[PDB]
Amino acid sequence: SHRKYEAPRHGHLGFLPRKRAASIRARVKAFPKDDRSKPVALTSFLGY
Amino acid sequence: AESHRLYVKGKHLSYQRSKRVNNPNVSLIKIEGVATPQDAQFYLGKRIAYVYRASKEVRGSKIRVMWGKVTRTHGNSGVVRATFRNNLPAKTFGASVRIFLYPSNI
Amino acid sequence: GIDHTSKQHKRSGHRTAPKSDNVYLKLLVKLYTFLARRTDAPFNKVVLKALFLSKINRPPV
Amino acid sequence: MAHFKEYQVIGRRLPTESVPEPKLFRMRIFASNEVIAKSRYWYFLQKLHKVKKASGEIVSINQINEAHPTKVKNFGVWVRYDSRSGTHNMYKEIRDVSRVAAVETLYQDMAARHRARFRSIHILKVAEIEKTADVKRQYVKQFLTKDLKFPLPHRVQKSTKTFSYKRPSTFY
């Protein structure tokens, strides 16, 4: 049967599994797309 | 010369079987070049030898031979039936087998 | 498959040897079996069937 | 039902002591052998006269051969078929080389286009069309034109071996 009333889902299903990360430093999965006209420069940096 | 083959190569396909029941006493051999049961009548009665290797050297060699012969044709695509002195171990499905020319009727 | 009309492996239903263990009675059966097999006389075949009968089938005369 | 043949069958239905010398009926049967030609003979005499197999007998059965089996003819075929709902009459035209070959095409054509089996088809009359410009069907008039030429594009060349070392060409 139906629930009793409709209610929203608890939590986000895209952030699964909620496990411990493989390293203390998070990976950069994506980088900005290259533009051949621009000069050579870095895309990211590291800090604390 | 560079070739000493005096036999015709063959392929062990499977046992003589129904949809669910198989008979290990009869084996089906696919001869290369034969595609007609009329052309498969030439190979009737020819001796068949299966050559495999073994770990234990019994008579100065590690190669053992299993002998058989051609009994009759099977189907409409040149497949023939073969009965060996001892049945094939059913692990040679698709393995190459040797079909000789004797006893020749030519 | 055979469509059987009668009963398969059915015995004859008649006695072929006496049930008694009398050794002297079996000697008469042995003697009269030879007689009915080699004389072709109807008398000897009646004696064999009469010698196989039970006590109630041989009333006193 | 099989490779057809044409037979003629003559009935006699048995002469009694009151009426001798009966009328000796006859018709033409398209069948596979002499077994079905006699069976299909009694099927139509029970639709036209007071007669059955037990009250009659077969006089003579003869196979009719084609007079000119090597000449292409135009045939007009009248049939009586039974559909799923009702019975309808139909006239069809088949261009073939013999009377027995036009019947073969008719049974395959009626089963493919109308789902009619052999038991539901009655052969009323088959006749050769003597003159042209009498063909009223469009699928036969195409082959009666002067200087008929037509290609066969996309030749599907049947192969025997499983693997071919060349890329096939469908030229003609």
Partner: protein, 146 residues
């Protein structure tokens, strides 16, 4: 039909016997039509049946003929004293057909060597099967079973 088949000595599949055609026997054949196939045999198929599958019934035993003396011993009082006199008594139905036909054991035939020729066996031969009245084409199918 079960009782009729037992009166024609057809107790198993692919069994054969000769039947004299009369009014009484023609009505017997119409009852067991969906189970038997019959027809008119020629001389060649009758001759080959007795030579290969000919067995006599002597003292309730199935004794192969194999000799002209055994036929003379049991059927010699009705004229027949050879293997061809019995054959002549069959195809030419004479006054002693009942004793000659009953002397022969029912024929034990095998499956036809070329098949039955039809996809389905239990239909009428007119409709495309194998049973019913099937005349002289019966010599082709009997000789394949023999």
């Amino acid at each position: 039909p079960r009782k009729v088949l037992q009166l024609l000595r057809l107790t198993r599949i692919n069994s054969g016997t000769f039947v004299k055609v009369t009014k009484a026997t023609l009505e017997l054949l119409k009852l067991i039509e969906p189970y038997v196939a019959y027809g008119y045999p020629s001389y060649s198929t009758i001759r080959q049946l007795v030579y290969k599958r000919g067995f006599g019934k002597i003292n309730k035993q199935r004794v192969p003929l194999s000799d002209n003396a055994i036929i003379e011993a049991n059927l010699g009082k009705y004229g027949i004293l050879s293997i061809d006199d019995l054959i002549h008594e069959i195809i030419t139905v004479g006054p002693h057909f009942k004793q000659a036909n009953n002397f022969l054991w029912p024929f034990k035939l095998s499956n036809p060597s070329g098949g039955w020729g039809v996809p389905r066996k239990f239909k009428h031969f007119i409709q495309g099967g194998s049973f019913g009245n099937r005349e002289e084409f019966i010599n082709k199918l009997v000789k394949s079973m023999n």
